[model samples]
Target: SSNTRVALVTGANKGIGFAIVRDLCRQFAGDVVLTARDVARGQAAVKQLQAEGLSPRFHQLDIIDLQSIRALCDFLRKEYGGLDVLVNNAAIAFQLDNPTPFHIQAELTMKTNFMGTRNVCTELLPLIKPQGRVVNVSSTEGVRALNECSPELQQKFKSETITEEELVGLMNKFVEDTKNGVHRKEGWSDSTYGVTKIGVSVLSRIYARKLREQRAGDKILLNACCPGWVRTDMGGPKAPKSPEVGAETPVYLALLPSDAEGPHGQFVTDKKVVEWGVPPESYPWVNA
Candidate 1:
């Protein structure tokens, strides 16, 4: 039990999270955890994988709750020694046509996508064993938004030395600016989801930096990646990539060889390292 490797994917009840767990179940040498916030949906997801002749264990996770994540952390420490792979894929986004107030969307989006991701990283990063891999599922919207930010905002985001506190403050500022009805005037982008993902992109680098400082020789690999526009509830039918196709980039990063040396802290899409601050090739449906 202590020596076995393990992989965990959050939001695995459906979509790319489900597919990530599915791919890992087939490819990863050790146990794969399919976690979700709901017990029924989480269990049902496990059964679906079983029907495909694949086996995956279920764990309940709510990234916004410290208690829930800590519970999972304790379970991993006790059951598997440490985590071998982690895919932070769970997030929320408002539908483009949804009539919700922008401020409300901003608050909820930040609550889950940015803050929750940081919370998970805080609780679980230390549990990563040597040579482990971590994949933070960001989106193309993140990079595109970075390209759109005011020059000063872009500088702070692109800074090699930006702290987590600084990123947190900026993220908080976005939500506040929205409440103040001045997000655009404050040089923020229009999409709350896009800005939250900027947090994901930068936070990935910060965590990778921390791993290097504290565990310099451990060789743990961590990166943020774009899953492309996939045909999921969030991405919709008009999106080009399927859930399985979107799973490829994240799963590739997750299963990086222990001997692999780099790609440690970059935004990846199409399984290639996308230059930070530069937008990826525009997707066809982005205008739809």
Candidate 2:
């Protein structure tokens, strides 16, 4: 295990996450672990990858369950002694077909997609060896569209000065306000998935800041990214890209070298950073 670069891709049983696992195995020359919430499905996926002449291990992961996440963290810490790459690619709840009402959608998305990601990062980050890479699979739809949200809401989102705690609190407030029927009054909106992405983008920045503050020697890189509009269970049939295309950016950041810094706290999509939720005269989307 001379090149013992251990990596884990969450939600890797299917779609973009699966593609990420495939790509990592093919490109990174490391032991890539593919994890899904369902054990059977995860193993099946590992089998498929092995058939393709790739070496990938299967692990069961239900990010919403802290116990399950912790178990995996412990296993990885013991198995590898440390992890080199972490792809936080587990995301769900796009209701393009069976949309939940404003409130329920907001609540579920925040809890599962946003809060769940935060929890995983907190638990697994310590296991990441120095100079590791952390890639957060976020979405382009979360970019701020000034027209999609009000001015005050837009300001809060666009502000680089806002702290991660404030961003997390804002998402929590959105869920609460949605339930109470006052989301709009509190400068939040009804885009369930967008709010979750906001949480992810903030988490990336927050965790990166903390890592820098600790002056961690190995130099961890954390970045939020959208794999692009791809066909998946959540991305409908009309999606213009394939899962391989969507997995590209996450894989890119996950493998970035130590010199790849500065973009640490940014929201990325289509292989570049963009402003969340907003359109611009230029390519402002990457500014997210």
Candidate 3:
């Protein structure tokens, strides 16, 4: 299948990630790889999809593990030459009722949600083929949390010229502040999940900008999206939307038309584009 195109979805053993894999298997022109940390679980998901007469390949990927990420990267290069679509759907969130210490939660959540995604991009982004699309599954809470931040912090988060190192610094600072029980004093919200997602939303913006500068003629499209509240384990039972509905926005971004322009590096929800931080004017699509 040398002419075949390929799409990959991470943490796709269940929930919205699973649904995204199913949809892509049915709709995408080429192969769909459903990846998860657990090989048996991932293969089981692929088997279930195959029962539906859909073919989806399985690859073991633990985004937190650099070696695992590089293995997958090597496979993609050897098999498909490059990736056409990448949906970063793997993430974790602690329930409000969980009793884990705040600082502990802060460290673990930031590690998987923010740092994990960054590691994936670092390894795989270079293999994104021309006209590729990348969708980072961010949350609306990221924006809400930004609105809750102090003005000075808000200005930093919204700066278009903010470098990746600076973003990493701020994210580390949040964890440290939480450890010191001074996250609130540092102008961060109480929600560690929200803050980590803000990292994702901003990270997508930074990566999109980098892609624009480094591969201007490649026509690669990258953006962050909020999948809406679904009744998945992460969203809890009280949430209104189903997993299928939640998959809509992320899938929409993943399937953006080849020739379409705009919306790159922006945060989107309910299938429409939204601003990253408050006062919106600070985070322009292009830097001055």
Candidate 4:
């Protein structure tokens, strides 16, 4: 029991989520739970992986539903005491081809991609062991460059100086804007999932900071990542890479040892540390 570690990946039935589960089962010292909103699909995924000699247990996880999130959190806490890894992989993209107007699409996407994700983290965060890793699956579509609507908008999103609260407020504003049909007026693009991912990126920093403050001797790292343009149901046919390729970054973060902590609260991709946003005019610290 002491030698076994526990890992959970939300929305791990297929695609990049499945790949992450499969790889983690091979690499992580504990049993990997393959969670999904749909029970049959999740079980089927586990069976498929089992056929390939990979063992991943199945669990129901519908992040949008608070009850479901709580149930899973409780189960994990009782079963494992504390979780070592959490990959928030459940998300949706509604504008790969076309969006369903501003209001309709934005509400739907944010409910699942942003707010629901936040709820899941809130429910499960207390169970995360010290030095546990949280990898929020974000996208390049969520990048500020996609919303090149105005200089002010770009500056707010593309500045490294943006605080966690400011970023969350921005995402919340996007949701409020969509609900009130004022997204376009607020300089938001027609992408629903993009807005939600921006929130995901923002929440990563907030949670990372909170974790550090709460646990003085522990290393809890949280970071957002764009898995590149990969081919999946959402990524579509003409995307750049396959699901396995897309899951690489998340799996790498999940595998991080106790000593790796400097990259906390930063944006990472492809296992490399890169600039999150445009540099401000003046600098204070050495690399600041």
Task: Note the Cα lDDT for every prediction shown.
Answer: 0.91, 0.79, 0.89, 0.78
Best by TM-score: 1
Better-scoring candidate (TM-score), 1 or 4: 1
- Top model number, lDDT: 1
Q: For each candidate, give its TM-score against the true structure.
A: 0.97, 0.90, 0.94, 0.88
Please write out the lDDT profile of model 3 over residues 1-288, one tens digit for every residue: 146789999999999999998888877888999999999988898999999999899999999999999999989999999899999999999877799999999999999999999999988999898889999998878888888889899899899899999999999999999999898888888889989999999999999999989998999999998887788879877777788778988888888888776779988877778766643323214322
Encode model 2's per-residue lDDT on 58-93: one tens digit a residue: 889999999998899778877888788988888877
Model 3 TM-score is 0.94
Each prediction's RMSD over C-alphas, in Å, is 1.4, 3.7, 5.6, 6.1
Q: Which stretches of candidate 2 lie over 4 Å from their true place?
A: 1-3, 97-99, 145-147, 275-288
Candidate 2: 10-residue stretch with minimal lDDT: 279-288
Model 4 C-alpha lDDT per residue in residues 1-288, reported as the tens digit of each score: 134578899888888999899889888888888899999999999999999988887889899889998888778877878787899998886654474666667778888888888888888888888778888988766665345445577677666567766876777787787788876787877667766776787678677778877885778777888777778888777776799889998898888888787678777777875565532224223321
* Candidate 1 root-mean-square deviation in Å: 1.4
Clashes of each: 0, 15, 0, 0
List pairs with backbone clashes in candidate 3: none
